[PDB]
Design a protein around this ligand. Structure first.
Ligand SMILES: CS(=O)(=O)Cc1nc2ccccc2[nH]1
Length: 149
């Protein structure tokens, strides 16, 4: 069983946390976004999402970097930084991910996610968990890299 906690989308960008812990590799992140018919955001896409109201308190992949978007300074989120905070030094490789859905609304979309449209056949139950607790479950797989399996 896999839980995927997702957020609001902001200019198409959203955050995905797997199994309540930093547990996604960069290869898995691309596959996971592909399951949402999405891609890893570019830094420009992320900056526009930030400008629409997106912030999290979790490291996640974008294309090329691991970041935390921050609007409001918080001492426990990205060392009190604002803007798209870029992780510079870390020993480790597993984070959450951001994803970008080009078909989402242009600004804040805080409706819930009710599908995992591009998952593959598989036996494991994947549950999308919204911030409001609503859930969408479907049996499937999204990982293509043997290293992640
Ligand atoms: C339980 S796990 O350590 O997150 C490995 C895993 N990740 C998956 C993603 C989709 C379907 C099955 C999956 N099994």
């Amino acid at each position: 069983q896999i839980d995927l906690n997702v957020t609001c989308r902001y200019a198409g960008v959203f955050h995905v946390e797997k199994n309540g812990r930093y547990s996604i590799s960069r290869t898995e992140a691309a596959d996971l976004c592909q399951a949402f018919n999405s891609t890893l955001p570019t830094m420009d896409q992320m900056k526009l999402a930030l400008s629409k109201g997106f912030e999290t308190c979790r490291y996640g992949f974008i294309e090329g970097n691991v970041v935390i978007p921050r609007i409001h300074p918080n001492a426990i989120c990205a060392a009190n930084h604002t803007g798209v905070y870029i992780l510079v030094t870390s020993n480790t490789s597993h984070y959450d991910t951001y994803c970008f859905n080009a078909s989402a609304p242009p600004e804040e979309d805080c409706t819930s996610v009710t599908d995992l449209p591009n998952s593959f056949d598989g036996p494991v139950t994947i549950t999308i968990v919204n911030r409001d607790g609503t859930r969408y479950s479907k049996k499937g797989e999204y990982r293509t890299h043997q290293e992640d399996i």
